[PDB]
Structure 1
Amino acid sequence: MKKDIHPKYEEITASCSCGNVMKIRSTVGHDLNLDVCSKCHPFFTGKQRDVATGGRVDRFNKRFNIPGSK
């Protein structure tokens, strides 16, 4: 839903500050938008920036298209 080239992640696991305590760690909550994409629009293009972290061997299709196509 945010990284969708690599589908989903909200796991529920913890931070052990005094034995196996249930202080949950893994719940991500941070969001980014906008990049100059494969035709003309600086388009809504969501990220964390993960997706674009991963962008260094694509030509604007081979990964990017996974949720684009079907």
Structure 2
Amino acid sequence: MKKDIHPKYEEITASCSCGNVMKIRSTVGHDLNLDVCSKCHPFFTGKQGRVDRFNKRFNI
């Protein structure tokens, strides 16, 4: 990389709600608080009609 031209780019900590904590280089400066991550998002884990209804509402 060239000198003097690029964003400041240093290690920080990304702390997610699910107890996942990852140290990562970034430009954000401060530390991150993640409401979701790759280890708790439902797509990544896998946490992702008329006859039924008619017969359940009209039990004879």
Q: Give the deviation of 1:10 after TM superposition.
A: 1.4
Pairwise CA RMSD of aligned residues? 20.6
Structure with the greater alpha carbon radius of gyration: 2
- Say which structure is richer in helix: 2
1:12–1:24 CA contact under 8 A, matched in 2: yes
Q: Give the deviation of 1:6 after TM superposition.
A: 2.3
The alignment-based identity, stated in percent, is: 100
TM-score normalised by the chain length of structure 2: 0.20
Which residues of structure 2 form unaligned runs of 5+? none
Which residues of structure 1 form unaligned runs of 5+? 49-54
- Say which structure is richer in strand: 2
| 1:17 is aligned to 2:17 | yes
2:16–2:35 CA contact under 8 A, matched in 1: no
TM-score normalised by the chain length of structure 1: 0.18
Tell me, in whole angstroms, the C-alpha distance in 1 between the residues paired with 2:3 and 2:50. Answer: 16
